[PDB]
Design a protein around this nucleic acid. Sequence first.
DNA 1: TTTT
DNA 2: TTTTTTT
DNA 3: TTTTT
Lengths: 241, 246, 246
Amino acid sequence: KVKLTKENIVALLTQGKDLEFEENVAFNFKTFCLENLDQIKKMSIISCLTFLKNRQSIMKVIKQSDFTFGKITIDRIGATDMTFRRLDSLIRVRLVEETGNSENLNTIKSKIASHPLIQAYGLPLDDAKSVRLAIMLGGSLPLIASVDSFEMISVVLAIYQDAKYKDLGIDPKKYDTKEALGKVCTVLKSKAFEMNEDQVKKGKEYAAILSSSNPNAKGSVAMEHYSETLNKFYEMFGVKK
Amino acid sequence: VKLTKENIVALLTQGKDLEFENLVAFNFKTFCLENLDQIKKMSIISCLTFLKNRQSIMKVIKQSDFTFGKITIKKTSDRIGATDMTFRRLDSLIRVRLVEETGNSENLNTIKSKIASHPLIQAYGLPLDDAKSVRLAIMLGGSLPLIASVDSFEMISVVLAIYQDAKYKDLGIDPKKYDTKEALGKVCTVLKSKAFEMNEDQVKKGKEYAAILSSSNPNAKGSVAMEHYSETLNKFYEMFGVKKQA
Amino acid sequence: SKVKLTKENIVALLTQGKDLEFEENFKTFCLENLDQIKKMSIISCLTFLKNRQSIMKVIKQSDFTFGKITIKKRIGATDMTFRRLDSLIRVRLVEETGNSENLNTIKSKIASHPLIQAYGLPLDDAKSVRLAIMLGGSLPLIASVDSFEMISVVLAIYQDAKYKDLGIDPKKYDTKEALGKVCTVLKSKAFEMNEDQVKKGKEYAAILSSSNPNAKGSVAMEHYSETLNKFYEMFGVKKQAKLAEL
DNA sequence: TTTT
DNA sequence: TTTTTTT
DNA sequence: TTTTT
């Protein structure tokens, strides 16, 4: 029995030797969060929301080459290392904190109505919890779930994305929506997180806003615009609209 | 500011408030007007072959960067430009090209004969008598949201979209692979975006197509299980007790 | 007129006014590179299967090179891919079940693999062990190797039927598409299922029928199975109820 | 607006 | 519903 | 514990 590594896999396939892989250190993002979060709080709240909006756009440019910003620069990742998903996740955790201040919250909610991911969910933007979910959308749920009080909002969003992946236009091949939820629970069990009635009810408040979201708007305002004519064709075919 | 690497380093390193912009506004009708001439250089028999072998042809194109003539599919990733050529954009051009040829008697006759053996055809039990019926056949399997933006193709798109929506069970359409409500929903967005109005002429035109669809004899399945294989496959489903055959 | 479907033929289809038609091997790939994999230990092979998913991520980490062979992660017909490696090893392992002593080693070791026991597959004879080697493999690839046709397509059907019981996610693995691809392979080699091949298939199907399938998602999701299911049903149909006070 |  | 990181 | 819509 040998530790599962990259150099062992090349030897597995090239040698007549009998090899097995131990399976059975430890990275904590919450601990990582406590460190680098102070550094991201020096970012402007506006600079953070631009990051969320251009996430995929910013990502492609960063992946062009070794990307260096300040003293940190973004294939086995060390526990102190900064990753794009880790940068994204810090920025999201940071922003949720600002939803406790009314002045920042108004700017966030208003600007947060203009995200590409937002409106696609058709998520209602009413209270602070409504804003936090918007900040949550598109983030690395396995990472963020490890931060305290972020456990339920993470696993709740994970299930909704798993359930409604079609409506949300989520390609299961591009994004494994089951695996994501599977990973979240792995993280919660590592912190021995237990889901009590308070956490579950807290989750249900989160869950409510997600049910009230409307994943497809444009396609449902044009259909009703032509519904008089559309329904006349429905009727000729089997069933009556 | 324009999105660059130096603006991103300033986003993360400065207490300054920064902004940048994302996707490309695309209009298939314009794309069609441009690239349709390049597709007119294909043989009509070659076009129907493309349609008949759609899935097979796609996979080969998707193996690598595919270049033909001036056109290149550029494989995938980095999103898609409004000027760029895609497989679906290619497929839809070929269908649009074919539908125009239905104004010609000799061409109408060759297509009608050649397209009668396609797998998607026969699955609909579509009768091929007149020109309008043949257009519907060319239409089958095509990207209705793309083709609908092209002039005069609005009604045939939305009527077929609704029919697929009503008869999606009879047609053996998997709701997970193809959301038949979403598809109709996209077509109307396209029609509404060009301010298409359904007057009595268009509605009357729509009904001419719809008539052809009621008279059609829709058939589920029509997959790649041989007439030699259907008999043996279902014995095993029954062995697992999961066959509905009788 | 009728031509083989290739990349140069598709360019000729689109760029030439000539009339072209089509009208429709890994086995060859198998005969070549399998000898490279035969130097592996049978135990090393079973380690590969057991640790399939984990090893894959390490391989997908970068361009993976072992011996003369390298996995990039475009693909040549001769290039080696992860699935091609996995399928080679599974074919290799099936050959070794023709030897009684090796059959014991495989039977003993593979009895502890996660996919087995999830199937609740009983391990008695050689044919039972082959099905065990078969689990999780690429059915369309392995189907192209001779004499692997029936075990491939029978297992493909069992999975299409029992995907619910096996805890198989239709989103991650299209259980119909897989079956569809296997038959496509059989038709491409013009495979015929006579009474004997079906009799052979029925022998396999029997063993899968005698199996008792029990699957649960990973380790942690089963630990949280009681609380998790409560959340799925709240996102069922459509509901917008808010909860106000006065 | 994509290997539907 | 052959080629891919498809439980 | 990664460029996962």
